[PDB]
Design a protein around this ligand. Structure first.
Ligand SMILES: N[C@H](CCC(=O)N[C@@H](CS)C(=O)NCC(=O)O)C(=O)O
Ligand SMILES: N[C@H](CCC(=O)N[C@@H](CS)C(=O)NCC(=O)O)C(=O)O
Lengths: 209, 209
């Protein structure tokens, strides 16, 4: 059959994956659970055949995956986009785990209570990470070269997110602010963001702060 | 030259990498910073040539990597151990991101203050993850088959850790308790754990709780 991706109905960690799939004009159906269907899940949580039930999940009829990072890499690997050799592949991973630092850093807090108190403690160190990227896209169109690569989409995420936390963190960093438009300027990505399938909110679990 | 790995002087996220390297009888020198040398770092933090300075780092004279996960995968990829095809590689990733859930879950708290209060909230959900593994090693010697694979070592980590947090979480889960001995029963892994290079404490940043 044609790919079946599932996860809640938000952005969390599936979005980067959404964008990528979309970017490759891939065919896929979505299983979305609401703010109240939190049990509709609890039921099929096993019925599916995942050796590691969790969210999001992906069934290829060729595979049954859990773990968000594993899902996106797969979709990638099925397009040569993972690498060419040890050196390059470990380079995207580096880029990968780099974009992560931001994102996870965004939730290791967002759910807690001292947000307004811990975000400050984050925002102090935020720019030191962001800039690193800046220097990357200085003489490059996308984090790796002329071709795209999932990390590009994963970054487009961290950014869209942070920019709700403080729409100024990117001024000092110009090239990044172009990377965003550059991405949002890919036909594919456009057709999506302007349609119905696009989830504009929330960024995490409805429960979050 | 011969590989050069660096990180603080603890376990954190480098250990799984340590074990693996050791397992492959690889040659490598270690850059270890003490509890007070927290500035000895701050200096070379850039002097090195990492496009994404952070800890741990690895210089192959072929590459300069940051991001712990990227480092271990590399060492792996340089031994066919990463996969064979899309399906299998995304399977180790799944196993990968699975072992992660435990470990990170162990620090998203360990540093905070309500440990003794949040660990309970963790330990309630711990077994639901652990068991998943249990069912994996039921009819297998290691998380993937007869051959080893880095995730095996990453798990041997989560375990050695948790078992300081509550030495009973594994009783109900027998096969895992064998996996531990099974691992600690690899000549290589033995020669290490019983030597000087082995770091027995702490599991995280000295600062931690
Ligand atoms: N580290 C994540 C683990 C998943 C996770 O944290 N999932 C959340 C999304 S906010 C979900 O609620 N999980 C389902 C569950 O707890 O059973 C991954 O690789 O997918
Ligand atoms: N997600 C980690 C990022 C690193 C991290 O959290 N590193 C800690 C180890 S406890 C270190 O202190 N980082 C150095 C720094 O902040 O400059 C990775 O992939 O390596």
């Amino acid at each position: 059959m044609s790919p079946i991706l599932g996860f809640w109905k938000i952005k969390g960690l599936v979005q980067p994956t959404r964008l990528l799939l979309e970017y490759l004009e891939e065919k896929y159906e979505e299983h979305l659970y609401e703010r109240d269907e939190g049990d509709k899940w609890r039921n099929k949580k096993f019925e599916l055949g995942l050796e590691f039930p969790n969210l999001p999940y992906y069934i290829d009829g060729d595979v049954k995956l859990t773990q968000s990072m594993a899902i996106i890499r797969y979709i990638a690997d099925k397009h040569n986009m993972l690498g060419g050799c040890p050196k390059e592949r470990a380079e995207i991973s580096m880029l990968e785990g780099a974009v992560l630092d931001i994102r996870y850093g965004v939730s290791r807090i967002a759910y807690s209570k001292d947000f307004e108190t811990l975000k400050v403690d984050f925002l102090s160190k935020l720019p030191e990470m962001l800039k690193m990227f800046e220097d990357r896209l200085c003489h490059k169109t996308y984090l790796n070269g002329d071709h795209v690569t999932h990390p590009d989409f994963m970054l487009y995420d961290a950014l869209d997110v942070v920019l709700y936390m403080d729409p100024m963190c990117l001024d000092a960093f110009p090239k990044l602010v172009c990377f965003k438009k550059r991405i949002e300027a890919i036909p594919q990505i456009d057709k999506y963001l302007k349609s119905s399938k696009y989830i504009a909110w929330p960024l995490q679990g409805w429960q979050a702060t």
